[PDB]
Amino acid sequence: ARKCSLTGEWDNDLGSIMTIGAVNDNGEFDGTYITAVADNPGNITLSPLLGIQHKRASQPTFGFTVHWNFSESTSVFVGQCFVDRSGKEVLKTKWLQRLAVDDISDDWIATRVGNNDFTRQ
Amino acid sequence: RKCSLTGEWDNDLGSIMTIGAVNDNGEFDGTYITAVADNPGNITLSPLLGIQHKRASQPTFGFTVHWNFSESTSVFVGQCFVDRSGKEVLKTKWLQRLAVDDISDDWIATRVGNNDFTRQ
Amino acid sequence: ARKCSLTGEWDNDLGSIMTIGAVNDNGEFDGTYITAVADNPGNITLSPLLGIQHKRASQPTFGFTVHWNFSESTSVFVGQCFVDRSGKEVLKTKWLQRLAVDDISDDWIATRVGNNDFTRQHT
Amino acid sequence: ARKCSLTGEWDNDLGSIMTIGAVNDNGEFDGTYITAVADNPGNITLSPLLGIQHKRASQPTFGFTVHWNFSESTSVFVGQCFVDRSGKEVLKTKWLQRLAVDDISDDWIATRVGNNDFTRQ
Ligand SMILES: O=C(O)CCCC[C@@H]1SC[C@@H]2NC(=O)N[C@@H]21
Ligand SMILES: O=C(O)CCCC[C@@H]1SC[C@@H]2NC(=O)N[C@@H]21
Ligand SMILES: O=C(O)CCCC[C@@H]1SC[C@@H]2NC(=O)N[C@@H]21
Ligand SMILES: O=C(O)CCCC[C@@H]1SC[C@@H]2NC(=O)N[C@@H]21
């Protein structure tokens, strides 16, 4: 396995855990995501994700979408995978979380922003 | 159904997006022709992948575009709204990640913005 | 007055209004923000802002902070003032709204992001 | 001095330093920001900031603007000051950096987003 293939198990600074499947020839992948935190944390369940990474660069950019199975929200993550001289991989990401609102007039309220660093589990 | 993302959309910048069939889990692929880029002479049609909620009449959704002509990747997240006349609008916010050479330069690498899409 | 001096009265695309006073020699200004929207819209009242713009540029960047007087939140706006050939000014802004949470462990949830375009009030 | 008065000297995770002066009755303050990073770090100079914090809350929110004195850019920071059981203060912030572009048609490219945590010097 080449470094910065997203395939494998990762966690982040909030305690969330992500598993990513095989990455195909075009950089596409699926996975699962167990968030440590939510608007309603009692409701949390494992949720699916789908994304794409670049493959030429040793330190590729990537993004993915998480369809939360327990709420009407969706999150997206985008970032770059870095490798240090010891071979330690870190995903540096920023994210947007979209809430569902019932009226288009309330759109302004509905997007949160943040960051997460992921390392191999 | 209204707010099935399948079809052709454009946005306020002139970009054009086509989305394929949405499967039972809300997954879809598509293509994106951006009207703008860091190097607009290099723009080519690029692939996207994402997921929408299915039940809601006004579902949230997300997708990733893998730009085929740069090292960058963008993600879009938003909600599809339908007014009482039947008109659909995708209200989105996006992040664009640029590639940097070293982890110490990570702070510089993420742009944020917005786009509204309507059917082409 | 110069185009893109922030001094004056501005509308945005959510129906909000702000009025900004004189911009000093360092680009600093104060004003009052009247939001059309909020987490608790029945509590809305006018709220103070404070910011800085670049002064020399024909199309300057700027930023400001709004201290909401009716909640524990603070918002910041950053953007650029553009002037078209007819003299029409547009403030293209992006914003972050910070909500107050009680525990550092909930920090991840606390920052909303969005955009606003402002134009000068007519007359 | 009460905890989470912003007056004083702070640094962040990138190594940037800021010094904030007296906070007035309305929560207003000024100061100097010394960024550790820039598009061109050989051009970095001391730059002014101006902001407002809430005063009554034990863990107040606040924001400030930095007018960079060595580029046409402006940055804004927004966050909350937290105090732990031992009295240690942390400012958890997110920021936007606006770059100057030539025309309104280029506006889409002009805004970076990020995060910083500050602690007292
Ligand atoms: O709250 C919800 O309804 C869905 C879960 C949202 C979890 C968010 S996604 C961004 C941040 N990073 C995480 O690992 N969890 C939160
Ligand atoms: O510049 C690049 O290298 C890739 C193209 C990025 C285009 C961005 S994605 C966000 C914004 N919305 C658009 O339709 N195009 C731009
Ligand atoms: O909800 C609150 O407690 C305070 C008001 C927040 C209003 C926000 S700031 C960003 C957006 N633009 C506006 O003109 N109003 C909203
Ligand atoms: O590059 C420039 O033209 C001005 C300096 C920008 C520095 C940014 S502001 C956000 C981030 N946090 C910092 O402490 N510095 C960078």
Numbering used by the authors:
A (entry chain D), D (entry chain C): 1 to 121
B (entry chain B): 2 to 121
C (entry chain A): 1 to 123
Extract from the study:
The chicken avidin gene family consists of avidin and several avidin related genes (AVRs). In order to characterize the proteins encoded by the AVRs, avidin related proteins (AVRs) have recently been produced in insect cells using a baculovirus expression system and have been demonstrated to be functional biotin-binding proteins like chicken avidin. Interestingly, the biotin-binding affinities of AVRs have been reported to vary over a wide range of values, AVR4 being almost as efficient a biotin binder as avidin and AVR2 showing the lowest affinity for biotin. Each monomer in the homotetrameric protein has a β-barrel fold of eight β-strands with one end of the barrel adapted to bind D-biotin.
